[PDB]
Design a binder for this molecule. Structure first.
Ligand SMILES: CSCC[C@H](N)[PH](=O)O
Ligand SMILES: [Co+2]
Ligand SMILES: [Co+2]
Ligand code: NA
Length: 262
């Protein structure tokens, strides 16, 4: 079931969360035209292991072969880094990192725009981030997860985009993917009331085109069925007495770390 974190658990999650955010801050300058995703993966891994003295939660997970997930353009999620995949001007790329420190996980991701942005790419990234922020603002004890998924969907669809149904946010802590499943759309199947001490991620995947997706032969890579662009952002949070605290906040986030209701 849903694990409630103790204060000591939470302290450890703050550290892991900050470490993960830091990998994202760190990598920025390397994201340029001509770099391969395989190289980005190596830089991230070295940092995690050698500087942070932490470990990547992805390496070996269900056999995943790399340290982070890098998803370019039409890839929705779980893109596998490769020395042969080079970034080009206009690409939009998601880098999703999950670090383990002292047994606790920190999971977060953001989009990067390579070189000169395209109109669609910039728009898509912006809207996706805003959808995540909207959701964060709603988190508080007593509310049903359903309301959050419904809000994300309505926002996104109003902007002419679609939300991916298949992949979702999830509880996180000592475990990588714990209960509950955090859907990014309205579903009558969702019935979970939030309570303080719950820790989970919100990580909406939004497509420029239609919602349909397709899993590749590698068994990890997911792409949009219509080849439209897809974007995603993710944060790990903790439900507090009157709101929430964002554990993976970065310098570039424009939302406050602690959100309070009253
Ligand atoms: C190769 S497993 C990677 C899982 C992602 N961090 P998701 O946001 O749980
Ligand atoms: Co992630
Ligand atoms: Co996640
Ligand atoms: Na993408």
């Amino acid at each position: 079931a849903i694990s409630i974190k103790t204060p000591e658990d939470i302290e450890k999650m703050r550290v892991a969360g900050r470490l993960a955010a830091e990998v994202l801050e760190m990598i920025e300058p390397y994201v340029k035209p001509g770099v391969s995703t395989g190289e980005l993966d190596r830089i991230c891994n070295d940092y995690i292991v050698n500087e942070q003295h932490a470990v990547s939660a992805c390496l070996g997970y269900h056999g995943y072969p790399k340290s982070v997930c890098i998803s370019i353009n039409e890839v929705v999620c779980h893109g596998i880094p490769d020395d042969a995949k080079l970034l080009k001007d206009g690409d939009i790329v998601n880098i999703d990192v999950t670090v383990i420190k002292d047994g606790f996980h920190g999971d977060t991701s953001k989009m990067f725009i390579v070189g000169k942005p395209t109109i669609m790419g910039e728009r898509l990234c912006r809207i996706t981030q805003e959808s995540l922020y909207l959701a964060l603002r709603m988190v508080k004890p007593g509310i049903n997860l359903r309301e959050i998924g419904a809000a994300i969907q309505k926002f996104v669809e109003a902007e002419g985009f679609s939300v991916v149904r298949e992949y979702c946010g999830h509880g996180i802590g000592q475990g990588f993917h714990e209960e509950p499943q955090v859907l990014h759309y309205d579903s009558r199947e969702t019935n979970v009331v939030l309570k303080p001490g719950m820790t989970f991620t919100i990580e909406p995947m939004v497509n420029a085109g239609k919602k349909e997706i397709r899993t590749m032969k590698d068994g990890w890579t997911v792409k949009t069925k219509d080849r439209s662009l897809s974007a995603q952002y993710e944060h790990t949070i903790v439900v507090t007495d009157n709101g929430c605290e964002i554990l993976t906040l970065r310098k570039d986030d424009t939302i406050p770390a602690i959100i309070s209701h009253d």
